[PDB]
């Protein structure tokens, strides 16, 4: 069924931040499968325990963007998440109108892997045909962005999108009001904001933005939405300015607004992709597939020169993720002579740009890591940099490389891994079991605070220790106990 | 013979604007062959009829350049053209000194197809060797342009070029005076200007500019002429400024002048082609021929990315016809998977740039045009745009595609095709025979004016209707009758 | 042995300016082998003759850089050079500490060909791995240059580097003091400067700069030296400014200084090579080797378009030797159809850029030089340009092409070859033997001056005439006689 596929997707696949489909933002050690929908029903049914704080906090995760900026992905506390996912499942026949929207490019969809939200998933041919087809006969292309979107979505506006603003205000139960309550329970009983990364917040965002899409559609606008980005194709500048006005009205009705540093009108014909994308692909040494693998295999100077050219292009343009695109272009066709050179270049690029650390997972088997302890000092210097810059995805990926490849990790860099206080980093140090006593000091400092929001901020670490019998639950409810009795592990093996 | 080849070329091949050798400016439905030299002799011999207006007007044709600018090509009225071509033929032993000029790159020449004027015809190897050989040892490259050339060539200066200015002024018969008269009869008995596109005006321009070439040659200048463009190679800046001075004097003697927005001195070594040409060819995915066709066949992403890069390069440089060069680079090596994608990209580019419409004639058989009437609305939206922008070559090419592929054409776009009043468009609508009555209203409005110049502006439409027996001749002379009796058709089949 | 290999290298291989390893700065007609170490010992042992001038002058050679700037390479007078080379040989166990330095990239080393100093010699893979390895984890890259280095190295500071500044000042014999004296005797008994091109001056420069390298090393700086260029990799800007301060102190202690027009701090990650290098290599049509030679063979338009793109890139960037790199990329894979076109393009580029003349030695066999005397006028027009611009390497290479290919050379260009007064040019005219009498006038004007420094400036011409029995020695010492008796020829055959 599609209800069952959504129920699997909300918990087994898209609970953790898993929207990016090329490389994940979270290392593959952390997996949310075995958190089955029946365990979510049992958690929702459980009513024990008393909480002194309204709502639940989230395990935080600062992922690095192309400009090294942090984006705070969140792992919802699972007692607050099981109710939210179960509510979205039970109400799916009244929610699936977001699937029938045609202006939302990334939306819930029955993906084969098990997910429902995968950004940048559709193939290049259809994307090109759509871009030309919608750019047919038009003069201007308007790009608009919602300012926060994740930051300031109003949860009380979830019924406003569903049955209208004034009908919902008069009505103040209906399914969308309980959805608003359950979404609020996900993040500290707070009206504004949604945790970034779970598909439940993507569904909540799609529900609110589908009314905006409906009103923009009914006024005859050619437009597409990519999460919070609206692209409009306009025969004249009348359409260009009036779409911006109508989008501003429709967002302001649901308390949202437009990012005016991201608004720009560009005369068609522009570029189907961004300009740096075609600059890289035109100069890519892999741009032609030769149908024989020896020809497809690249040389040392070819890959290195393309990587230098990508570095200059990112310094000179910087409009997008130039390094990640360029590295994905050359990463899978490396010859054995290249692997050490491109590996060290990736070490250089991963230090300077910590979002490039996941690509280091491709080469680690082919590179002989023992060497003369060069890579040993490299990964620790990266770990120190990720501790310094407060970057969670680079820290977690580097620690996944350190435990998976058994490379030792220094004490002084751990002094800042423990002091940074990223939860997912501390779960990796927790799964190592060598640093049991520095982990114990941190969790004891959390418990001695007697602040439930800090325990909810480190719920993944606390649950991993409780499931590994190294600690008891810090909660008086049965949620951790129902998780552990059924075998829920958020750091599972194969 | 060469006299006979010129006589064929003036009427069968280069009567209509046919100078461009890669893609024609006029669709292949309009062909000037079967207008044989014997029919031209019979037209010249005929002396019947009375005309109230001095001279004849021309069928006008606004072709689109690389910057979307119109250039008004002209189809000379054939009673005024037969006399001109016959006069140039009879006097060819006194005209062929323009063929012996060595500084005129495009000039009358015995081409194999049947033409005598083909711009951009010589191969790249000789052009490169000439450019290096003439750039041997020199410091500066001067580029100069005649301002109007076609716009303000003085017809009375045709004998001035032939026998000298003062000798011709004292002489005021010689063959060049009758050539001046016959050239004036081509365009409304007007002294200034030549109809752009016939080879007779190219011969007239070469006759006048050969004296300029002779004087510049005798003063020891290394220079080449491309229609109205002079390139000079200079050992110092003394040569650079003095060539500009002498060219200004020699043009001002024959009443011409220099385009001073097109004058520029560039220090050698510059670029053999223009800079965007090498930028495209260096980045072209077809730049290396592999001697096997599967390797020569291109992929989807390769062609699309090169086309986006060409769009950015034209937006960023714009110095030449970047899109046409880039499309000619990739057009003939398309794989079957590409054809729909590159076709839609060409639809996007043809709408924005109407000179790119002729390339749509390459792909139309390989594209299944029935579809879901998408291409049906595309070609009509292009037709509306060409009606709006007053672009004749895009209109004529799109109509040639519409009749040849049998795709239907809307009434409201025809409301502006009839209102634009391009003659060659109305001959396509005339050959369709569905819109017989809107054509009849236009020609009746022309005839009711009783202005012979408007009848001469639509002589091709009037002759096509008269030859198809749908209308009588609007002329009291026998020229149309001698044309029709011998079977002259300007819209012939095979 | 390594002492013997150095002794061979100082005289047989690196006496003449031979540091560049791709194409030499001096044509292959001039070779310093057969000037064996035993002849150097016999010259050093000889004590006859009286000289009225202190020291010896050098045969001068203005080589053209990438910006057409002259660099004055010098061929040391061999009586002053044999003593210097023999002194460096005898003291090699006290000099070889410059070989153990790890921050000097170009230094004495046992090369296979016979040299000890070859700049730009190490392979690209190690250079890339070193550049990434030293750029590991750092924020800034400091580039610094010694201002003159060759121009103002203080010879009295040779013992200052060897045993310390104050110890050497108090000591005022030790081996480094006699090295300072012998280095002074090389150039006119002058304290400042070293003749550029002999390896003895490279050894003298390495001796002085190794103390700077030692002090910079002991203060924990990651830095590399390329002759006179220091590159430093810095974790912060504290290291960046403090390295510049310490390098300025260490150079000022040995009387040197920093080129402050060549000092710049660039945030890593920059470019491993320069930016134009990756721009050329990414756009190079030879960037992928196909393992079959027909595929590796290039077409006409491909090479010509890459050469035009290189010309624009050098006009637009100009940061390095863009033309020489681009030509070396395509020079060895030319197809037979290309050779004439790329040859004429190289003629164009050699005229405008005289450092590109040596590449003309690759193509001269494949090009049929007889033709219609086109290349005959080309090489003479180049010879006139090299005479005009006072460029010695272009003159010498063009004359090597003229004598080797037997192409005639005009009298009026020889009027300026004789008037320029480059010594190596006059040795080529001397070896031709046709122009025996214009050579005789020049050497008689030199001898009538009775200035020993001019005779030392043309010692190579004087020795070549004396060894060819066309003239007697202009020296009262036996050095020329011991050279000729053992068969020393500086223009030898095979």
Tokens of A336: 């054995």
Axis-axis angle for helices B37-45, B78-90 (nearest 10): 110
Chain C residues touching chain A at CB-CB below 8 Å: 124-125, 128-129, 132-133, 135-137, 268-273, 275, 277-279, 281-283, 287-291
Cα-based distances in Å from B269 to A296, B234, C397: 37, 12, 21
Cross-chain residue pair C312–B275, CB shorter than 8 Å: yes
Cross-chain residue pair B136–C351, CB shorter than 8 Å: yes
C143 membership: H or E segment, kind and range: strand C140-146
Rg (CA), chain B: 24
Tokens of C426: 């006059």
User: In chain A, which residues have their Cβ closer than 8 Å to the Cβ of C277?
Assistant: 305, 308
Experiment type: cryo-EM
Q: Name the residue facing B285 among A128, A288, A290 (closest C-beta).
A: A288
Number of H helices, E strands in chain A: 24, 6
SS3 C70: strand
Cross-chain residue pair C302–B279, CB shorter than 8 Å: no
**Closest approach of B98 to chain C, Cα-based (Å):** 27
* Mutant choice from A302, A312, A347, A363 vs C, greatest count of C C-beta within 10 A: A312
A226 forms bridges with which residues in the sheet?
A229
Instruction: Return the number of CB contacts < 8 Å for A and B.
Output: 71
Give which of C236, C190, C227, C178 is closest to C205, Cα–Cα: C227
CA atoms within 13 A on the CB side of B88: 34
User: In chain A, which residues have their Cβ closer than 8 Å to the Cβ of B344?
Assistant: 129, 132-133
Contact between residue C34 and residue C487 where contact means Cβ atoms under 8 Å apart: yes
**Closest approach of A342 to chain C, Cα-based (Å):** 9
Cα-based distances in Å from C442 to C187, C413, C415, C449: 23, 16, 12, 11
Distance CA C379, CA C357 (A): 10
Distance CA C261, CA C264 (A): 8
Distance CA A452, CA A456 (A): 6
Distance CA A427, CA A400 (A): 11
Tokens of A412: 């002084």
* Mutant choice from C285, C286, C290, C312 vs B, greatest count of B C-beta within 10 A: C312
Axis-axis angle for helices A124-134, B338-352 (nearest 10): 20
Q: Name the residue facing B344 among A133, A277, A287 (closest C-beta).
A: A133
Number of H helices, E strands in chain C: 24, 6
Q: Which letter does DSSP use for residue C141 in this model?
A: E
Phi then psi for residue C119, to 5 deg, are -80, 150
Quick one: how far is CA C251 from the chain centroid? 23
CA atoms within 13 A on the CB side of C363: 29
Tokens of A197: 């990364």
Contact between residue B207 and residue B160 where contact means Cβ atoms under 8 Å apart: no
**Closest approach of C357 to chain B, Cα-based (Å):** 14
B203 membership: H or E segment, kind and range: helix B199-218
Tokens of A194: 């949604």
Distance CA C459, CA C477 (A): 13
SS3 A143: strand
Cross-chain residue pair A124–B301, CB shorter than 8 Å: yes
Quick one: how far is CA B288 from the chain centroid? 31
Sign of CA dihedral C53, C59, C65, C68: positive
User: In chain A, which residues have their Cβ closer than 8 Å to the Cβ of C290?
Assistant: 295
Q: How many other CB atoms sit within 10 Å of the CB of residue B476?
A: 10
A352 membership: H or E segment, kind and range: helix A338-352
Q: Name the residue facing C128 among A299, A304, A351 (closest C-beta).
A: A304
User: In chain A, which residues have their Cβ closer than 8 Å to the Cβ of B345?
Assistant: 128, 132
User: In chain B, which residues have their Cβ closer than 8 Å to the Cβ of C311?
Assistant: 269-271
Q: How many other CB atoms sit within 10 Å of the CB of residue B374?
A: 13
Q: Name the residue facing C308 among B125, B278, B283 (closest C-beta).
A: B278
Give which of C423, C476, C425, C467 is closest to C446, Cα–Cα: C423
Give which of B28, B31, B30 is closest to B12, Cα–Cα: B31
Distance CA B490, CA B229 (A): 32
Contact between residue C128 and residue C174 where contact means Cβ atoms under 8 Å apart: no
Chain C residues touching chain B at CB-CB below 8 Å: 283, 285, 294-295, 298-302, 304-306, 308-309, 311-312, 340-341, 344-345, 347-349, 351-352, 374, 378, 381, 385
Q: Name the residue facing A344 among C124, C129, C289 (closest C-beta).
A: C129
What is the DSSP annotation of C275-287?
HHHHHHHHS-TTS
C144 forms bridges with which residues in the sheet?
C230
Cross-chain residue pair B272–C347, CB shorter than 8 Å: no
Distance CA B179, CA B91 (A): 9
Tokens of B332: 């003939």
Distance CA B187, CA B55 (A): 6
Distance CA B272, CA B267 (A): 13
Distance CA A157, CA A493 (A): 41
Residues sharing a CB contact under 8 Å with residue A126, sequence separation 6 or more, in sequence order = none
Distance CA B307, CA B344 (A): 12
Tokens 């000039």 label which residue? B107
Contact between residue A179 and residue A158 where contact means Cβ atoms under 8 Å apart: yes
Instruction: Return the number of CB contacts < 8 Å for A and C.
Output: 71
Cross-chain residue pair C311–B128, CB shorter than 8 Å: no
Distance CA B277, CA B322 (A): 7
B234 membership: H or E segment, kind and range: strand B229-234
Cross-chain residue pair C124–A300, CB shorter than 8 Å: yes
Distance CA A385, CA A392 (A): 11
Strand pairing class (C222-226; C258-267): unpaired
Q: Where are the alpha helices (DSSP H) in C66-135?
A: 78-90, 92-95, 124-134
* Mutant choice from A282, A290, A313, A316 vs B, greatest count of B C-beta within 10 A: A282
Q: Phi-psi region for residue A114, left (φ > 0), alpha (ψ -120 to 50) or beta? A: left
Contact between residue B388 and residue B416 where contact means Cβ atoms under 8 Å apart: yes
* Mutant choice from C68, C304, C376, C386 vs B, greatest count of B C-beta within 10 A: C304
Cross-chain residue pair C345–B132, CB shorter than 8 Å: yes
Distance CA A115, CA C445 (A): 93
* Mutant choice from B134, B136, B139, B273 vs C, greatest count of C C-beta within 10 A: B136
SS3 B2: helix
Q: How many other CB atoms sit within 10 Å of the CB of residue B191?
A: 15
Rg (CA), chain A: 24
Q: Which letter does DSSP use for residue C122 in this model?
A: S
User: In chain A, which residues have their Cβ closer than 8 Å to the Cβ of C137?
Assistant: 351, 378, 381, 385
Taking the C-alpha atoms of A266, A267, A268 and A269 in order, what is their torsion angle to the nearest 10 degrees? -90
Distance CA B233, CA B246 (A): 14
Tokens of B72: 């008004």
């Amino acid at each position: 069924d599609e209800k069952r596929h959504l129920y699997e997707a909300l918990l087994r696949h898209n609970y953790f931040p898993n929207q990016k489909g090329s490389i994940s933002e979270i290392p593959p050690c952390f997996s949310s499968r075995t958190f089955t929908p029946e365990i979510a029903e049992l958690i929702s049914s459980d009513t024990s325990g008393r909480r002194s704080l309204q709502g639940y906090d989230c395990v935080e995760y600062y992922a690095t963007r192309y400009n090294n900026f942090p984006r705070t992905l969140s792992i919802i506390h699972p007692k607050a998440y099981s109710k939210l996912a179960k509510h979205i499942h039970d109400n799916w026949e009244e929610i699936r109108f977001i699937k029938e929207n045609e202006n939302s490019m990334i939306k819930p969809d029955m993906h084969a892997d098990g997910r429902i939200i995968i950004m940048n998933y559709e193939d290049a041919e259809t994307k090109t045909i759509r871009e030309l087809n919608d750019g047919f006969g038009r003069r201007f292309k308007v790009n608009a962005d919602i300012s926060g979107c994740f930051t300031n979505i109003y949860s009380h506006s979830i019924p406003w999108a569903v049955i209208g603003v004034n009908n919902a205000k008069i009505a103040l139960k209906h399914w969308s009001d309980k959805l608003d309550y359950f979404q609020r329970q996900a993040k500290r009983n707070e009206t504004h904001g949604v945790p970034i990364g779970p598909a439940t917040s993507s569904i909540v965002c799609e529900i609110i933005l589908s009314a905006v899409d409906k009103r923009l559609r009914d006024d005859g606008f050619l437009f597409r939405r990519y999460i919070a980005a609206y692209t409009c194709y306009c025969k004249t500048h009348d359409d260009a300015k009036e779409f911006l006005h109508l989008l501003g009205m429709e967002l302001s009705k649901y308390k949202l607004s437009l990012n005016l540093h991201k608004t720009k009108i560009t005369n068609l014909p522009g570029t189907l992709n961004d300009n740096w994308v075609s600059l890289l692909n035109v100069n890519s040494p892999t741009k032609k597939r030769f149908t024989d693998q020896d020809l497809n295999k690249l040389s040392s100077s070819e890959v290195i020169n393309f990587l230098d050219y990508a570095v200059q292009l990112n310094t000179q343009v910087g409009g997008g993720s130039i390094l990640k695109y360029a590295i994905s272009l050359v990463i899978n066709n490396l010859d054995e002579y290249t692997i050490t050179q491109v590996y060290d270049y990736l070490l250089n690029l991963s230090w300077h740009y910590p979002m490039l650390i996941p690509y280091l997972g491709v080469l680690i088997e082919h590179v002989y890591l023992d060497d003369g302890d060069e890579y040993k000092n490299k990964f620790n210097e990266i770990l120190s940099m990720c501790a310094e810059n407060k970057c969670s995805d680079g820290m977690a990926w580097t620690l996944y490389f350190c435990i998976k490849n058994n490379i030792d990790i220094d004490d002084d860099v751990i002094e800042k891994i423990i002091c940074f206080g990223d939860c997912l980093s501390l779960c990796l140090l927790d799964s190592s079991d060598i640093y049991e006593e520095k982990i114990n000091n941190f969790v004891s400092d959390i418990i001695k605070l007697d602040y439930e929001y800090d325990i909810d901020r480190y719920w993944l670490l606390f649950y991993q220790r409780f499931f590994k019998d190294k600690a008891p639950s810090p909660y008086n409810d049965k949620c951790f106990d129902i998780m552990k009795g059924y075998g829920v592990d958020f750091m599972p093996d194969e």
